[PDB]
Amino acid sequence: MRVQSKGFAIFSKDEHFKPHDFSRHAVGPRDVLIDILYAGICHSDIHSAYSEWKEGIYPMIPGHEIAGIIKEVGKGVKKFKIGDVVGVGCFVNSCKACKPCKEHQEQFCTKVVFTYDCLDSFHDNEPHMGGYSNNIVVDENYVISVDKNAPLEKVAPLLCAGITTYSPLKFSKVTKGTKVGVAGFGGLGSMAVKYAVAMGAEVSVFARNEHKKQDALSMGVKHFYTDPKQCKEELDFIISTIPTHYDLKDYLKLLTYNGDLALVGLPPVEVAPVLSVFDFIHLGNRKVYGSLIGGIKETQEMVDFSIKHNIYPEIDLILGKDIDTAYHNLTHGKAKFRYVIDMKKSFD
Amino acid sequence: MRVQSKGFAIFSKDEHFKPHDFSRHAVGPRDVLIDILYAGICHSDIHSAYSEWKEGIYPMIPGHEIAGIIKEVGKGVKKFKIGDVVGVGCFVNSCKACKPCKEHQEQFCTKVVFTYDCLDSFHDNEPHMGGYSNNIVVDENYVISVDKNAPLEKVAPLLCAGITTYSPLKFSKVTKGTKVGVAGFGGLGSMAVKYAVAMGAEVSVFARNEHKKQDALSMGVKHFYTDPKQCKEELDFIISTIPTHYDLKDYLKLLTYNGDLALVGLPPVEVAPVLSVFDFIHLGNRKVYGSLIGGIKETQEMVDFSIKHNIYPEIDLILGKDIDTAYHNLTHGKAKFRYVIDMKKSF
Ligand SMILES: NC(=O)C1=CN([C@@H]2O[C@H](COP(=O)(O)OP(=O)(O)OC[C@H]3O[C@@H](n4cnc5c(N)ncnc54)[C@H](OP(=O)(O)O)[C@@H]3O)[C@@H](O)[C@H]2O)C=CC1
Numbered sequence: 034m035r036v037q038s039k040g041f042a043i044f045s046k047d048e049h050f051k052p053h054d055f056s057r058h059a060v061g062p063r064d065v066l067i068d069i070l071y072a073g074i075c076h077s078d079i080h081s082a083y084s085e086w087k088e089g090i091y092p093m094i095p096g097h098e099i100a101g102i103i104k105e106v107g108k109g110v111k112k113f114k115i116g117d118v119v120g121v122g123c124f125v126n127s128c129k130a131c132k133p134c135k136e137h138q139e140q141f142c143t144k145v146v147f148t149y150d151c152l153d154s155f156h157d158n159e160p161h162m163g164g165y166s167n168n169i170v171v172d173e174n175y176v177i178s179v180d181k182n183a184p185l186e187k188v189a190p191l192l193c194a195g196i197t198t199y200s201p202l203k204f205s206k207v208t209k210g211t212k213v214g215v216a217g218f219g220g221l222g223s224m225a226v227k228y229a230v231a232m233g234a235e236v237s238v239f240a241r242n243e244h245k246k247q248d249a250l251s252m253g254v255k256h257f258y259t260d261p262k263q264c265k266e267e268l269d270f271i272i273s274t275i276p277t278h279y280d281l282k283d284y285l286k287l288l289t290y291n292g293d294l295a296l297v298g299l300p301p302v303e304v305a306p307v308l309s310v311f312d313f314i315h316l317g318n319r320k321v322y323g324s325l326i327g328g329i330k331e332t333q334e335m336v337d338f339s340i341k342h343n344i345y346p347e348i349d350l351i352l353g354k355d356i357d358t359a360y361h362n363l364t365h366g367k368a369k370f371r372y373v374i375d376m377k378k379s380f381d
Numbered sequence: 382m383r384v385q386s387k388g389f390a391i392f393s394k395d396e397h398f399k400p401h402d403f404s405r406h407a408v409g410p411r412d413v414l415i416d417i418l419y420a421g422i423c424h425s426d427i428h429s430a431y432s433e434w435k436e437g438i439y440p441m442i443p444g445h446e447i448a449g450i451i452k453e454v455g456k457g458v459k460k461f462k463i464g465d466v467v468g469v470g471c472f473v474n475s476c477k478a479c480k481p482c483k484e485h486q487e488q489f490c491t492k493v494v495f496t497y498d499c500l501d502s503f504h505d506n507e508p509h510m511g512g513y514s515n516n517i518v519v520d521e522n523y524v525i526s527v528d529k530n531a532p533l534e535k536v537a538p539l540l541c542a543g544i545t546t547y548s549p550l551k552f553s554k555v556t557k558g559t560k561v562g563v564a565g566f567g568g569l570g571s572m573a574v575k576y577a578v579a580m581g582a583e584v585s586v587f588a589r590n591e592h593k594k595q596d597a598l599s600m601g602v603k604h605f606y607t608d609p610k611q612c613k614e615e616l617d618f619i620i621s622t623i624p625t626h627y628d629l630k631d632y633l634k635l636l637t638y639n640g641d642l643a644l645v646g647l648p649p650v651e652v653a654p655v656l657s658v659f660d661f662i663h664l665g666n667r668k669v670y671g672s673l674i675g676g677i678k679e680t681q682e683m684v685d686f687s688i689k690h691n692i693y694p695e696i697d698l699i700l701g702k703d704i705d706t707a708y709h710n711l712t713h714g715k716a717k718f719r720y721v722i723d724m725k726k727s728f
Pocket residue numbers: 074075076077078080193194197216217218219220221222239240241242274275276277278279296297298299300324325326327363364365366367368370371662
């Protein structure tokens with residue numbers, strides 16, 4: 034039997050979100066049915082909702098920062114029981130037979146099923162629906178285990194903001210004394226800041242004004258800039274989470290010899306920056322790479338780490354009916370860090 | 382007293398080379414006068430000659446692969462004597478006072494003087510003339526010491542093709558068992574192969590056809606492709622020397638996790654490939670950087686290493702009057718590896 038669901042859907046790129054009844058695939062012998070308690074809003078939600086990257090699949094239900102409780106399990110499930118506290122991230126399935134799947138980087142699988150705005154090739158190519166909803170059905174190998182005493186409203190954005198920034202920090206070996214820049218001081222940015230500080234880094238933040246400078250300082254940030262040109266120092270590592278137009282050269286030039294610039298931010302495609310061969314050679318010996326989310330394994334490692342060291346996103350709790358207001362704030366320079374939807378209260 | 386010279390000049394971006402008489406600044410107290418014996422031809426000479434990157438300064442005398450013999454020294458010269466065999470690469474002066482200068486990366490000095498197609502601010506902003514000529518006057522700190530018995534025609538291209546490929550291989554710590562790809566099998570491509578092979582790497586070459594497949598095999602190349610999509614394994618390190626349009630993503634996607642793509646090739650600016658943020662993220666965990674020539678100190682080390690291990694470019698000797706044919710061959714797929722001008726025989 035298909036699982037009945039409800040959530041907050043957008044029907045085309047210029048409309049408002051509305052309550053939407055729908056259904057998901059039946060609980061298969063390896064699936065679990067999760068009741069969703071908290072749903073983080075990521076800026077990827079907005080880019081997808083508005084078709085800023087590509088043409089979206091509508092009706093769309095975004096949200097891929099999911100924290101909840103296991104209500105039901107398929108009969109072959111071994112990794113979870115009813116009552117378990119869990120999280121779901123940016124994808125819910127992959128082919129499990131390719132090189133990326135075998136290397137625990139399922140996010141690069143060519144048959145990866147992202148949580149929303151993506152056809153589910155494992156269920157007759159039906160559109161997958163995200164986390165702005167009351168439940169979700171996920172193959173057990175894509176579910177993150179969460180400590181039952183962790184604050185669940187704070188856990189939810191670890192599922193995307195947390196892994197996406199944790200991953201390149203570890204990949205570039207950020208450690209004690211590493212000079213780290215964080216460009217874009219929002220949901221991902223503040224997680225990058227917290228992890229780099231917990232890792233022993235000396236952290237610089239680049240924002241567009243000083244509205245959150247005190248929160249930066251309170252996080253242990255050593256330099257706060259409102260323009261990359263103000264930074265007079267060479268950095269070893271920079272993570273750019275910027276979701277609007279900018280010039281990659283302004284950051285690449287800040288790096289020391291053999292420094293890394295890790296790109297996670299994803300502006301709309303028509304304004305997204307590029308680097309040419311001439312740019313790399315002019316600013317030579319400074320390395321650039323991209324990072325996409327993380328694998329299931331490293332996502333589990335990151336959640337475990339974050340709960341252990343009490344490293345959580347700064348969140349503001351809202352209801353499903355506030356989604357349009359949250360998206361406005363996030364696109365007009367009015368947001369703080371993460372918004373999180375209290376899904377139980379939204380569905381009274 | 383200005384030094385008198387002659388060589389082979391282009392007078393605008395769409396013309397043929399012509400014999401040209403000209404003069405150079407006098408031998409200053411830290412300068413040496415060098416008699417040019419062999420002048421390597423670099424594709425950078427063509428891009429500059431043809432204004433493919435920016436507005437050229439004409440008349441222009443390219444060549445930044447110079448081997449020769451010191452004929453005079455200024456009175457304050459302390460590293461060189463008359464008779465020393467030496468090389469000159471892509472630049473002839475710098476501020477000496479910035480941080481790149483001090484860290485032996487003079488090629489990044491904002492006041493660097495490139496060997497040609499560049500105004501020399503140390504000499505009243507006059508255009509500097511390169512190596513397609515009988516002589517050159519260079520500050521001694523920009524001159525490379527060359528073993529007096531090394532084969533000078535094969536030394537000349539070390540001064541640019543050598544350092545440019547040697548530097549990123551060292552920077553990326555290519556070593557025994559590293560899987561290395563080299564894209565564009567021409568002057569820099571062949572040097573890069575020979576270094577990587579000498580360093581014990583497993584080497585793949587990427588060309589546009591198989592005309593030089595047997596030569597790759599001769600040099601110890603393990604795999605030869607005519608399309609990057611042919612390559613079915615992951616590479617630790619790729620150096621791209623390509624001077625025409627291509628899609629960077631075809632190479633980036635061949636790198637293993639934590640692999641390096643090193644960019645040195647510089648196609649005309651109007652068709653220079655780019656990577657967007659979307660490209661990097663879709664192809665995550667694979668690092669890209671550019672490399673520019675090398676500093677003097679690393680250039681000296683590269684030359685010492687090459688000479689000591691007998692690692693030399695494959696060269697074909699030509700006359701100065703054959704410059705246009707050589708440029709033709711290099712822009713029409715008919716070149717082998719490096720052309721070198723036999724300067725003593727060119728006048
Ligand atoms: N796997 C991946 O690679 C992932 C990528 N992302 C992408 O990361 C980007 C950021 O996500 P999220 O953290 O949720 O975004 P949010 O808006 O929280 O944060 C973006 C931040 O960047 C600041 N900002 C915007 N433009 C600039 C600029 N030009 N310079 C400096 N700061 C700027 C914004 O502040 P203000 O507007 O108030 O000035 C805001 O604080 C999005 O494009 C999202 O799609 C997200 C998850 C995963």
